[PDB]
Symmetry: D3
Subunit: 291 residues, 6 copies
């Protein structure tokens, strides 16, 4: 990367300026998962990018998933799952494992990675300082709503305490578990939780790291890939997308309808995708705006 003339290095940096101005002092919530979480190079770059935002006076908040790591731990422990439709039932036992994996393993890795750059990252769940609560959610399988245990949606968010935490200079790394109104901790889908945090904190952007180039309208025709789409158009496209894309699209819809100026589906397999998406006009992602 040294053969590149220095007067073009300048123009790349200078071209970051309008986005540095837009985001200065703003909250950016980032859903982190997928291959950006499993490969060491993409991992280290993601943590560096969070340090970058933070050393620009931007306020990143990281929400992470970890579905496959939970499954692997359950298999190691010999915990036999029950399944309704495609969903595992989250017994009290499965939740203890889920919480222990997400908060005590997956979150820890990211906190330490980020903290290689400074005392920034702080790991938390909804349990800590009552930062957010959960409401038990049902799923509908083959047409009927049904209970799958201690799984929920974000209910209320302690917006004040959370913003104090970021104004203090910290990068929260959120593991999506929180108590319901009776103190019973539930596990929350990380995609939906990121949308709820973005809306509650008045975030400027929601970023959804996924393992795809971007949203295709008629997958897999290559030319169906789009750069920007409004909520109304995307809401009506929702029942046609592949299974994996629906949670990310439902998140983007709830966020931007909830007032978040834009939500982005970006390719987590690209090194420094966050830097590319926020400070460059040449991202592969797809931007969701209201309309």
């Amino acid at each position: 990367i040294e053969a590149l003339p220095t007067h073009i290095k300048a123009q790349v940096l200078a071209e970051a300026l309008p986005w540095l101005k837009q985001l200065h002092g703003k909250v950016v919530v980032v859903k982190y998962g997928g291959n950006a979480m499993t490969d060491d190079t993409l991992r280290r770059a993601f943590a560096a990018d969070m340090a970058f935002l933070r050393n620009c006076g931007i306020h990143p908040v990281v929400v992470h998933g970890g579905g496959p790591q939970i499954t692997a731990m359950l298999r190691r422990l010999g915990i036999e799952g029950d399944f309704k439709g495609g969903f595992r039932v989250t017994t009290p036992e499965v939740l203890d494992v889920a919480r222990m994996v997400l908060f005590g393993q997956v979150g820890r890795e990211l906190v330490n990675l980020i903290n290689a750059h400074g005392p920034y990252a702080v790991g938390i769940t909804g349990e800590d300082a009552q930062l957010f609560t959960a409401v038990r959610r049902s799923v509908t399988v083959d047409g009927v709503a049904t209970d799958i245990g201690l799984v929920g949606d974000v209910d209320q968010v302690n917006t004040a305490a959370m913003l104090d935490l970021v104004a203090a200079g910290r990068i929260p790394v959120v593991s999506t578990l929180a108590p319901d109104a009776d103190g019973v901790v539930h596990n929350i889908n990380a995609d939906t939780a990121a949308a709820a945090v973005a809306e509650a904190l008045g975030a400027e952007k929601l970023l959804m790291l996924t393992d795809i180039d971007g949203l295709y309208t008629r997958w897999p025709d290559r030319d169906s890939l789009v750069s920007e789409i409004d909520t109304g158009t995307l809401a009506q496209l929702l029942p046609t997308l592949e299974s994996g894309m629906v949670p990310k699209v439902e998140a983007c819809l709830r966020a931007v309808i909830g007032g978040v100026p834009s939500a982005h589906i970006i390719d987590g397999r690209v090194t420094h995708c966050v830097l590319v998406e926020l400070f460059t006009d040449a991202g592969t992602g797809t931007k969701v705006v209201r309309g």
Copy 2:
């Protein structure tokens, strides 16, 4: 507890006043472990007592252990241990389990218990916001110092950031793991870590919840139980005590020699032992002062 005349209920409360004055606005570090951690009634009372201190303008900091829960998880996972002397070698694998159990299971229970009373508890390790670091420690077995893996002592403490956290109204619940100067996370003995936190934070008292009435000089003669002892006298008694008492005594010595006005060995099998030890003159504990 209602047949008791109300004019004696008054005198019990009024008799708390000199200790409310002594501790108002002060840090109190509490090592929590033993039966006070395993029985639901003692557990719930301990969390209530932390809420009590906090609703008195006292600043509790909780450090917790969890040795037996780590062992049980290692056995569930089929992780064969290596043992030098009586010590398990903490491989990278054992540490991941230890961190996951201590921070993602044991700490979570206490945070949620305390938080039943309000948004007080916040769980953390040395990894979060670089709150404290670890230095790898050796043990000496049968006369020779020897390496037992990723085990250490508290190195430096981010005293400023930690006191900000408690001035903000929070009750930190500390899981004793922290990175060394290279970012490699170690597990720290909870007793020694509590002493280091008490000294670093300028605590007024260190409380060590143990499963014994108090320090016996010639166990098990019943009349060898003492109420108060100075560091010099106790340092010379150290090589005679039962195996389980040495870590708690070494902690009390390091703390009070380190400037902490008093350290207390109190019986964690007594419901509300904290309330008894701090606000009553009739505790069964033993108080350590300098001299």
Copy 3:
């Protein structure tokens, strides 16, 4: 008080917790008078209790009377009183004496008693920093309203400056005198003044120390004593009570109708009645709520 087992001392303290939570950070206004003011043991306990609240992060405000001490000083000075009905006419001369006794004698004793525990108490009237004003009040005697000199009701309260004073850590000890809109100082009934201060400061509780077990509906049938009563029921009972109880009941009505969550008539002859009433479920007082 030492023969009492220590595990019951614990339960008494632990049972204070729900009230410590309710009152933490809250204003509690206390009308202090009667035998709680004349006997040294009850006096010293009252001052200790104010120190207690304050060392719990509660914000006590004390309003005191002193009718009999004024009378005794007037007799010592040979000031002949004029009387309309049962009321002394407060000439400019009587007011100077009243102010001098209440502020320069009675208030001083309480400030010094409280201050034996720390730099807490601060004595004041409405004159100081224009903290509250008075409006001249009439009385009605044998059916007709009539002027009895420089006697009034609290008019406006400098709520902001007063709360600054308590947020600063101080325990105001208020002598009920204040200027009217022309700067002419009036003496205010201490019971009514306490109700006005409680309402103006947004107090959580008003406590009225009196020399009786509590409110009797049909004095003196012993079983007419009640524990709790709403404002509507008590307002209609008002014209039947003994002469001495009316000012305390009118105060409780004005306070709780004014928004104060509860007002309490408690027995000032009981040592530590404040501690008993606030932190115990076994008080002899009577609680007034709205309805």
Copy 4:
């Protein structure tokens, strides 16, 4: 005062500027007593002048005496005095009267006068918020030191709390009574107390209102009146002055030797003497500087 040309009114005001700059943001302690306290016109002007300083961003602190009012109250109460030399013995009874007169009568008048201009004045003694303490003082009569009861000198001053009070915009009006280290309240000579407050608060000036034109070296030769004198020269003149001047001179010596840049003996019989002394070059007072 209207026949005076307006271009000379201008020059008088403009000539205040160098002293407005010198005193802006500074503490000025003022001993108030004498005829400036007994005549209504001089009284009202003094209170106006305190409002003036305060509406210039200057921080006045007022210390007042009241010897003759105490005597008159003792005579009204039939309290027979005991006298050693020329000193009344301050029994516990005499002190209660002294405190009640100074704090509950004399201080009240000044607070209300000042407060006619705004919410400025606040009355206090050493008892309030433990603002200052007293140490019992002896007197020497006919050559021998001797006890005259509960009379003392200022011991320690809560400098921090006092300056908070003035930074908050208040004009403390101090009645010179304070507890000793055992809580026993003593009465303090107002002149000496003013010097101790000036030194403790880092005052820029001490003003001593007296009933004389200024310090005469050889009273009563008219030409012995001086405008300025250093501490060394005045210390050696001390044993020759008239009885009434010694307390004021001892105060000026202790203050300016204690670090106070200048102390002034000014004529309290002149209307607005404070305004004249501080903002004009034509004062009749005498200025004391170190040397």
Copy 5:
């Protein structure tokens, strides 16, 4: 000024008190121009008066003109003017000169004069920190509106940033130039700009230094001079006044109709006219109030 008795010096100072109270903590905007700007004695007195206000806890803001100095610089540079009616057309060249003269010459003199008394003055235009913007204004000549170049009126004012600047202790000295919404800097009439600043900052008074005794209704009958007039009466007098008085009267109208409690036309040829107008009842000015 020394033959004047000192008890009349006192009364002049004491008579400032009601105006010191009215203006304490308030913004006073002062249009400075005319002979008060050209003569060294009047200049130095004006700067002293600004120091005076500031050493009274008053917040002066100075707006200055400089028409004749611009003309003289244009003549020195050989810049030929174009004139429509009586107005010079402000080409880009004339503006550069105007800005350079007003900000780099005329403002500098006043900043240094004021700063002889302390670090008070700070020079600024609308360009600095975007403190205010301009909107291009037309003039009407011989009946028709017409463009005269880069001349405008104050558009929006950064009220927050400006008050921060004065709360910080500074005396802004404003040169009336500001960018329009496209960043193109315009020159603003100093009289109108002073009115807009007074209204935007919530000033207590606007002072307009002019070279006349005050407003005459039927110039030049001597007895037509008035002391006070309401906006309605003065608005209807507007089309009759001499050419030079209209900008000052239009300013006073816009200010006081805009909410400014009073605007004053005062004689800038009088030494210390500001001190005379604000702190004395004997000013020659004319006061404008709403009605």
Copy 6:
């Protein structure tokens, strides 16, 4: 700049991170002059770069020169210069012009350019709020020290007030003129003034924009260009450099010897030289460190 692959745009941005961390929250003083000031493209890029730093939480302070613009204005005004050696004598007349040009023309252009990006820039001299003073400097011509009028060096700097100004979010744009201890304004060489400001403000870096690639040791051998040099080595090279380089080298020496971690001589003819020098490893400048 769009044909460049986006995964290399990423690496350029990511490579800024170590310098974003080093400079976050730090003062950077920038001497701005030369062709970076005369060409519109380089001008606009410089202002953008100042906005960039500021939108990264870096604190730029800009010091500007303007020698040639002063000369041109003097020629336009027909002001005949006097010359001793190669130096113009700065008469009171030349200074008024210099101040008017630097502060009222050259500084204004940069403030408005920067402010196109936000309310950042604020123009000032040493005169404003007494921000810094000047001491008259002599020059030595043909071997003898000699007076050349109102020219000086920075004397003292109001470090506190200046850092308040930058902590408030502002970008000071400094015109190098300041009063001496008698209030007489002098003109200061902009290069030396930048070094004095960097040292006084505890800057992390001093940047000197010049019209050369960097420091050559044996100009003009191309291979004598160096990347980094210590103060000791450069001090001994000083008497050999071309005339134009000495002021920039003397500045770098005074700054880094004064404690500034590094000073940089960078090529002001390169677009975005600031971005290149601070956030890239490929700058053409020369870095000066202590040794």
